[model samples]
Target chain A: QGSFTMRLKELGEFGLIDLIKKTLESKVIGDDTAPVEYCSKKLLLTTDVLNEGVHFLRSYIPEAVGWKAISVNVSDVIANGGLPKWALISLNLPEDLEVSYVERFYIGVKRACEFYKCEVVGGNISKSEKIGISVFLVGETERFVGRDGARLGDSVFVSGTLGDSRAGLELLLMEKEEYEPFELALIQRHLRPTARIDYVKHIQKYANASMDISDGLVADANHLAQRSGVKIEILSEKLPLSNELKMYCEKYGKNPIEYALFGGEDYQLLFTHPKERWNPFLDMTEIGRVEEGEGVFVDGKK
Target chain B: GSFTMRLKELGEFGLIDLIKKTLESKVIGDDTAPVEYCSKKLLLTTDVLNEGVHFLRSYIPEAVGWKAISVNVSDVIANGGLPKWALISLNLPEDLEVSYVERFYIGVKRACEFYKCEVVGGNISKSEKIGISVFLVGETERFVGRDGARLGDSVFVSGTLGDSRAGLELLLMEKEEYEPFELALIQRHLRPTARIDYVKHIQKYANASMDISDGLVADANHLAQRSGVKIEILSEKLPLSNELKMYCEKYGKNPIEYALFGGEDYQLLFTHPKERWNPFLDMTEIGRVEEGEGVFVDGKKVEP
Candidate 1:
């Protein structure tokens, strides 16, 4: 048997700490230039340590992985109706982990963060057996939204469609026939799902209660229903699906409707509003409604 | 090439939101505990995480991974502190491709909220293709001390040594070389809880303060030396493990000496004025005072 040894003492804590510190690029605190007249309210948090084979695949593209990590936390602030302000990334890489790959990962994170005006704050780098990345993000908002604020009689709405990722998952696994150009689109959907922060802000004035849809429609609806102590009814016909989803399902002999109902990863907003507030969501889908009861009923069948 | 399918449909965001709700056993606005005369003079913070091989075997103990992530945050608050705290834990595991591991990975963030701490902190938990665990604990203190206070000082401490079910990990790992007595001794060392509140009150009159020493004599000597005074030493003056001391002497070395220097146990020691009242400290040792410098044994030079 071949034995490998790495002296942990050689890489002392201070040396390790220095190496980690060197990996991080310092950041300016808060948004100093806030439209001159407005001082933005910023909320900061970090999530690091998406280890290889643990949080993601060893073969996962560093760039995509980096993008996904930032997007995930940014989505949390967005779910709370806030705009992201800044982000700090800390990474622990193995000796063999490529420097280029690491840079590309940050390139992807920078792309997402810059797209949303979130500046890079600072981060650390360390030696480890697995690859790790943690992100600290700051978000700004005048009005913050939290769970436990849903009121009775508000109409429930979900932006965009559901289940594209589910279709992609099946396509990757089943060795089924590829669905021309349209089917390939389904695969792309899972590879890159958008966060709902932008839309949450656009319609903030109209929403009585709002949340982002990260879980499957059923699961998320159940959460909203149970937490608000009300029934959420979804019309079967109203679920939005990309044209590619329909074509791909037909090619693979899978139920697109079932996928739409139970599949998740649609980073869209699920919200409730009054009848008078329904017009602003006229362009959006009124996929569900709130009623006096518990649990969710699909298309009034329950 | 064989392409493994990804569990993409549970929706990353959706799963997070679901887990968030599942772990939220309590609502934010509910008030349950009564307001006692508590002082916020000290702040406590703790972070712990199970690295792949350190806390659990990577493949089998998935829930332990989750519990380890949660408990790191809990340990800080257990020492008396508020939530909305932040820090990071680094994890190194073997494979970086399993979705079960990915799902289990977020349990740390969930743990922060579970314990009423914030996920505002960040650290690395990577797959090193091996196992490791680390935590960063931040806390505030009106007063904090280790072992080794003067004889004239009042002693006050809380909780029974055996009351804590320490070293659950030892039993799980099946390290049974220790007898029942040995097991208890190890337990006392392994999972020592923080004395957050006890230290708060003790801080009021504590003259020379410190945490528990690896052993008693060495620790007492450390305090006595610092105060620039010689201490009249006593062997029976320390807390629990007198039986262990006997066990150690029979084995060869002085058990009392061993107790004086063991570093893992996180107990406290301090000295206050003789006039100070302490109903809490169950044991008190009356060592004599020498004129100056070093700990003494009877009339001779004592090596504590």
Candidate 2:
């Protein structure tokens, strides 16, 4: 029926994800990537698909694009406290693509593999109209943190700052010619975001619930809250903003808080810890508390 | 001092060579890469199929879905592994029919069932056309790659070659009428089976192996270059199905040429240590490893 396409449109991609997860009756479909236990070991696998206009734009260089591809999936793996070990990249590039761009793309791929200690073992490249990159990361871990673990009275903490990527992206979109140091840092944040791989052990130890902040603070907080069947009461003022983001916003007369709340591509760790188990870390900022309600509330109001 | 080469000019394998050098990875040559974890070895392989490239939108949805999984599994099976899990990433146009998506998943499910693997995870994104990528994770006790073929190894191929290429030729030619042979060829191209039945024989006996997705001649050359030995294929030993032979004759085409250079057979091209060849096999011993590099047919060399 004609209504079907409209229904799917209204349902959106997340609706399709929910339908497929239940249709396949898969246990490992949610929470970025789940662990598959095999006799004293856990296997963590996740796939992230990036298209030209949707996930990235050409304002970013080929190397940063490549680095971002690996970082996104590695963020998912590390969210589950898994150590990323293997990578498979599938790309669809234009037939007329430059060989040098391709070479630099893999250079960034190598940089990520070196940084994350994984190898690009296998992949396929096809000729297409636009750039479509899909990276599948395979990881190993002994313990895991799931999104469904947050309890009532838990302190929800977000690692690092948010909205810097959003500000950088805005700059790139407007084709800003010259950038201040802070603006360049924000651009770099958007280009080559880091995964919290170094913090996995701590997350696996203390985090009651865990998720990566790819979909902005408010959006991902809602996801964790919904999955954990609890409320996330975040103080809007408490949302972490980078100095670079604040400076960029000040120059452009933009609200840094709006970007921190609603902008995306942070690639930071958002986790919940029991009020008592919360040990303060330098980069981590306590943004909210897990409560009795089912949705995310800002400033104690939904 | 500055020059940019087009991918069309650099070619696929040339790009792969550049990628290999850039990644500096030892495990980049095979159809699948093996990662060892304790006693179990994990094999990883990924494939990307694009619309207007791999298939037209007019093509059946089920076949697209089936081909994506079937081809990926073929890679895993070729490397002496059993596919345990698969992650399917799909990029689809938003305006596509809902029925199309359902039928596509149906085909994916059936193929996954046939291969004994589960769809564990995937990501869906919007694109102008359909782009499907399958990332297969498999397990193997004994890992084999194309480099394992030695000087004394003999080469064997599982199943008939050229059927898929014949089928594709028919489709591309837009032939209005089809005999049983033509119909079979077309079906072979659309839904080619992986040589999954030979997994045991390959693991137990073969030294070097790869899926014949790139045709016998080119794939044989790949084994030759990787192993530093020549694959001397006896032309008469090439397996041509009765249907394929008939189709080729009617169309005034060389059946041997199809067997040699036509791609997407999805058969097994493997080499065994002369002493370790299988017992009571359906595969044909069509070639041998010689003390030279490159693939040859009756002593005539074929270039990669």
Candidate 3:
């Protein structure tokens, strides 16, 4: 009798987002922290939600979860050359959750806000069986830099090294632990990833197109390539690997390049700028070049 | 298990007070944060609703979707702002029907069109429960606050009260039948339409404004406490729908109690200087602000 049942798993997360974007014909859909014109003021609005078990585990510190929630959302605004000014956090908490867990969660949030110079403007707390956190962040920038602004002949660059966060997660996932400095570095990178907010001034000055590397270099680069109507050619060698990442990878007999290409949650900035406009004063690593055509490539390979 | 602190001990508002104290934000107390932008104030508000806590499994996806948008938009309206853009981050269960999503957005689309807002951005995640969290950004020429109620202000409420709670009772208290009145009560809770059309008018006249989600009496108490003034409400003045009246009548219950204590009405409760105070809307004169503190209903002090 059960012929077919189209469950949510079939649609998937990205598929449902695409379906929603298509149905709504969203004006600010494709870009994370999409820039909107509100009362002649250009505003950047972004939202991210994290479920307890899905996004993080009980093994992880509650403070880190709170920190990541703000970091992840703030990363979007800064990636677009905007400075986050305000945030509204919503928490769906279980009743049995320790009061200290929530207190520490906000403690992490407070520290993030202090570091980013952002204030928690408003929030609503609700009861749920599992802990869920959502943040609605707002920011403003004079220049509107975005993924869709990359042009042919532009150079692609990254604000910092990648894959340490992914390596960090690998450690956390594999029953976790250890005392090696490199191992500890990877775990810290994964748990408390820093958003490139300091680069906003530089990004506003130099970046022609930009996006945060939340969905990995390959995927996010692909998005910019398609959105900007150009092809991005990434060099396999130019990708930066931290010394800690390299040491950990060498010890594990793993390819550090693999983590660099596909690891996510780096909260690092990926931008495209004109080759001529580039300067040594900026903290950017040239990883690739933009060319005529579509899709992303690594060393001329798809 | 030891004498440890649990969230239930602090309760909902207690937890919010802790967050407020922890954040140390001046903008955290209002319905929406009013950020100064250019010539206008941008209002920011967020709301989160869980499946078992906010609604039941028997609720249709469309209704769940509609409530999420309406409740958030209601916050903006209370702040004397017009709905502009909203971000709805959804946490849906893995085994949920895909058709549930299709219908859910249908309600989302309907609410957006009704409120003159759009879902500009959103995120989707997988979780055990269906969680709908909404963040709305609105704009207002003049921002209104709870502390703005003056000594001579007259309080006004848009639409009738307690219909939402009546409807929720019909669902939780079970089958109110297929009767038309029962259906209307149920509809009020399921898909509430906020008092949005008169935002400009409210902004022009209201001294203080807030949405009556925690019932009329409770929210009025908030207004009185915030403004350092007392509110005198007439029990006879509480607006009750014909359906609410008749339903309560059939059950041999007092409709005034429902109107007094019911929550989730999504009605705009505002204060004006005088009787032309209606703000050119279908609003009822429910109360007035006076010296002292707390809310008095028909000469009897009422606490929410």
Candidate 4:
């Protein structure tokens, strides 16, 4: 995390953008894909600015800040099962922010858009007391993936793992963890969490409901449960963790389970599917099941 | 301007949005007329806002601010000659701005869309110490009018007056007085002032037309002088204010001369051929042509 700016420099703008472009291209979108019928129609999208102490902390690096701005909107389109095609960004920069930092920030944005085949056709730039980046993401969807689709008896699943972002945050707040063997990966994951659009699209063909894990498991699960009108139960033992997380949890005495449940910024795809239709291609974990009740429970407990 | 906010009770959000919605209905476009060989094509327009100054005045109500934000956008569509369509607003509201203000601001947005005339399918709301409101406006046009046409042409004008709005502003600023007639008229002028859609449609048949400029003699004379040749006119027959000279004299100026030259009324004025067209029904005849070198009064130079 200390060398994120340097890491960005090493990757360069084109390389970073290519990586993100590949990720967005390869990712699966659920119902959030823009409608195929309307593919030829003109798409309109836009972005806005969030300043330091206005929307976030100035201490936040340009790369992460830039990434977060695009990611959230891309996630919005993905949640709808749509593929974002165009993005219009409006950026507000602080006087104190270096020109190089701003350049890197846009590089991050370009990289994210390229990942998903999203093009930045137009945008506005202004000076402000802090850096603010807002985007209007235009995605085409003939059919929408709504928040309401979970059925009772459907199995709940999530792509990749969870809580790595929150775990990384804990590492930041407590200065004990120095750069060890696995520290870099953990830190990097926190700084730039990928949205699981690819996984969601693959599952959307059979999944009944889906969403991005933006606001932690508990909050997002509640969102799904409330919309789906079904109670969900997750097996805590099935909560997947990376080796780095396991190590961090062991050393800090932090419950990896708690981190998995309550951590935010994972940007993973959490979806529900009928048991018979689940695909094995995705490195998914069948962490939970949906029932007739409302809300969510882990390991069958509240 | 100090007491401007006090007179506006709806606050910035309520008042400005109220105007925005009204303007959206009358001006900003939504439903694009189906494209035909002769039909109008949709046109898009918008305005930008800066931090600290354009919006955050202590006297301006939130609603007025909202109105101010949307009205300028409405003006673009009005000028472009289309009904309002969609708006993409970029707002930078201070964090401490009341939630009601925020809701009211969105209320303006919702109202604009509600008409189904102008659809706002996209938006991004952020926090900025100095608020920025950028509105995108769309309209339809089959053809666009330009500034040049033939010489030896007759100049026809629309709308009845100029400088009343400016006059009201001067009064409002200097004496802080609010005359009912002047204030109401000025307010009417200020509130979403753009011509109806039919006028834009009619421009295709007319030649070398322009929107109203403050100096009637200068602009009309410009249209005549630039188009090809001769210019002659009558000043006493000019079709604006009967009280214009009095107002100008009271302000230690020539009223007839000031009325002829002063501007800011966004009315339509055009030059067309007398042989091809009869007098329009809605237009008032102020003066006619004379085959001389420059504009004139009766037979003399048109000096007030």
Candidate 5:
């Protein structure tokens, strides 16, 4: 007999999340946030932590970090069919950091709040060796839309283009000389991805189940499929790629499909709807359908 | 021409006050923000404790875990609210032992159980230094704010002070010889319990309240400034524990300094009208509110 020790890396991010969910029994675990009834209205609560090295670099502009932090949380709220209301930001800063840095950071946060109309209610600040920002957002919704609501025969749709952010990140990491205007757009997509909050009302009207695409299409689709107990068959050829992403891939001789499937931090909406219902929005791309099974299939193959 | 300096020159509290004033569009300066929803008021608060700055690595990991969660819960309770839910964000080092993390969670669970708070959700990420952030949600009816103190109101405080600060000094000194009484003080500093048990009683009777985290004098000044009143504390009437008195006697230290300026004692400091004061809660009447603008000691401004 052989004995083995469990490790966190072996568990991975999602696996560790599952372990934590199992350790703590709550009303909502698998979805983006926990939904609770308060004052006869449904409230959505979510939290995110961005570490200095893991989430960003010191060279990156502080304002972008701030914007990205709030945008990611707002994306979660919209995915759950809720309107972001209030936020609390906890910042851990180094002792010698300039006040101007903090001011600029808040300016970025204020920019996001102004766009979303969310209030910065309260927060705490402490000294640390590295910068760590934790944001807690509270939102409200008239109805709840979760990842477990997809039904068999429902058509799957995704809002906007996929893989642009991934391509942008690759461009940034490569640090190559940029010549084409399309390459600059790809980099912008990675640096400042917008949340799909404007389309949340339409999502509530048409979507049976919805989630934000933060962890790429294939992986996030797998999350939806497993949660809903349905199989999702995605036509790989039908994935909506932005014109800039397509041009960049062609110029760089890269596979656009890989970028679409494996590139993350897109902040696009992936959802399922009844096949009989027609979408009024032109931005939505229908690429798959739900069936009576489990897991996700690519091009009719598991 | 004189120019302003950086954050370190501004200091932690000064920077915090600057941030509070900057983010005053909504309610961003209080211990907790009260949001009304459908006839019910919900209180929200968040706190962050960083490794090396807030807690020492030599300290027990479980107590650090316990302190992180309890501190945030105390903020909610001080707002005259009952804590209901919590969200934790833990940034851990990759090389940390799994057993250390398990013990930390056990400590958090114990604190939550003691306060009757549920851990709803959380996020975990990798970091070089340990960082823990806790967000708490609570509910209240007749919620109290720090700015509600009135002239002629009596200032009251729950439990003994200076013990936690004394305990902290003892730990920092690390003396080999210690009595059982000394050990109790050390434990007090390491695991100062939140005063949520007396919140309901205070909310029912007190006009304004706050918890003592930053030295009593500074915190009392905050209460005075927020309430738009002056506070006169009788120096001789300050509460001191027998253990602290004995430790000071043996060590030739001044006990009053710790009671006045030392921090990290999570006790409640409240104010109530003199006519409405009753003997329901076991608290000490230490001072009185005056119709002025600043704090004083025994009817005199202290420059000592």
Candidate 6:
């Protein structure tokens, strides 16, 4: 008799999501968030989990954790073209953690909530060995967007620059000798990433499919492709990069495209627009186009 | 200079109360908060349960899954609403067997189906110990809250209590040999059902309602404080299941004490006007509400 032992890593995160999706009966399983109709209003709900060591370091500030926790879920709501309204936080902490730590954490939460005008409705606290925060945010929209709306010939666009957060993370984890202001700014970008909540209206008016780029550009674009059932062909050199990121890559002799294509945790919006109606925005860059095929292509190559 | 203290000194319940007090600006202190959207009231409630504190691994994984989902679902139902959707966040250990998670989801799915609730979304992550957080969204026309109980209202409870406490004790002590009654008591602790079915009926006739997850006395006090009234629970009127009574006899225990102070029964404790006490036959009138402060038994006030 043989017994099978399969680790979670073997299944991978996407594989696990696919498994869980099969078990779900609801139609709102695959997108960044689930959309529910409540009294003629379209409501969006999304949950994001940040585990200690997996997402952040103990040396990292609690304020960053609090900010990132809320911001990531807000990005999900905005990806679906909804205005975030209420947030529910669940915190699991060690027994001996300081009250001041918790206070500072909420200070960061309040800072972000006040900025976005989202209310901290309610939350739960539990005792655990490791710190875990899961934020569930609720939002509303008149006409919501989803990841399945992209069609052939839709132009792919991304808001803001990519790879700064990943570059910042690399700086924080590696390279003890950091002296420049640009380097410090990269670290700040990694710690305090912003969601594109302000772009939801524009996205609703223009984008065919939309999602946040928490995962790498290629990986996330593949998700858009899989959901939309169309191929995404990216012009690799057309990827946007911050001046600081380019300088750091030059200093380290690192491939800037590697950071742009494979580095993640940017929290920027990746969306697609129809070619016939090209309404351009200052913050967005047209990096690719949708084709009649599956999978993502880099510079016309898969 | 003095250094401030840690959270353990305040304890889990105290820390939660402090959090609620801090977030009072957004209506944080409630079993479920109703968010109005386009003429509809959506009730949202969140609850988090840890591994060792909430349940032991010796208890079956399916039971833990069932209880975790049911407890959160009960919060929505107790708010006088019908549960519409649910979001589950699971932090599981890497070394855990796949079968364990499969069984746990089976339990979750079964509980959700029983309540006519749908599992709309979820997030999963890796952790050292198991942590489960469930958020339930419900809807209501005329929703009831914990603070709506008034003077001269009758406090009623659906089903018996203390059986779950006895059942937990039996498991903790590893008592292998048990009578049929004892087995049923153990199952009660393992697979406690929510009173969502009766919530609609009670919400129509009652002034206030809340579910009892903690000790009966403590939870009753919460209802009283929220309502700004006094709750007088009669010690003699405390309902005990036949199984709990048998367990009490076998173990030389006072069934009333367990019924009063033991936790995790997951039963509904509601209050209705005395004049409107056309009571549901299954519900037992364990106490009454009066004009005053704090909770009581017969007459004496048991601390604020």
Best by TM-score: 2
- Over 4 Å off, model 2: A1-8, B1-3, B175-177
Best by lDDT: 3
Cα error, candidate 3, residue A179 (Å): 1.9
Evaluate every candidate with DockQ and list the scores: 0.08, 0.67, 0.74, 0.06, 0.52, 0.60
Encode model 4's per-residue lDDT on A233-255: one tens digit a residue. 88888887888888888887888
Candidates in order, TM-scores: namely 0.50, 0.96, 0.95, 0.60, 0.93, 0.95
DockQ preference between candidates 1 and 6, better one: 6
Worst 10 residues of 1 chain A by lDDT: A28-37
Model 6's alpha-carbon lDDT is 0.83
Q: Which parts of model 4 are misplaced by more than 4 Å?
A: A1-50, A54-64, A95-97, A172-178, B1-51, B57-99, B102-304
Residue B186 in candidate 1, Cα distance off native in Å: 3.9
- Model 1 agreement with the true structure over B51-84: per-residue lDDT tens digits: 4323434333334444554443333333333333
Alpha carbon lDDT at B124, candidate 2:
83
Task: Give the CA lDDT, 0 to 100, for residue A67 in model 2.
Answer: 91
What is every candidate's alpha-carbon RMSD to the true fold?
15.7, 2.0, 2.1, 13.9, 3.0, 2.2
Write one digit per residue (lDDT tens) for candidate 3, span B2-59. Answer: 7888999988777888887887767777898998878779899988777887886568
Off by over 4 Å in 3: A1-5, A174-178, B56-58, B173-177
Worst 10 residues of 1 chain B by lDDT: B27-36
Q: Write the per-residue lDDT of candidate 5 for residues B209-231, one digit (tens) a residue.
A: 88888878888888888899999
Better of 3 and 4 by TM-score: 3
* Tens digits of per-residue lDDT for model 1, A1-302: 84354333445333433333333221211111111112344333334345565445656566777777777667666666677765545455565544456655766676777676665533434445556666555555666554434667776677777788778656655555555566567655664556665565554466655666766888777767776678888887888877778877787787878887888766677777775676553445778778788888896675
Best by DockQ: 3
**Which 10-residue window in model 2 chain B sums to the lowest lDDT?**
B273-282
Assign candidate 4 its CAPRI class.
incorrect
Judged by DockQ relative to the true structure, which candidate is superior, 2 or 4? Answer: 2
In model 3, pairs of residues that clash are: none
User: Which residue runs does candidate 1 get wrong by more than 4 Å?
Assistant: A1-56, A85-103, A118-148, A174-184, A202-204, A278-283, B1-48, B56-189, B192-304
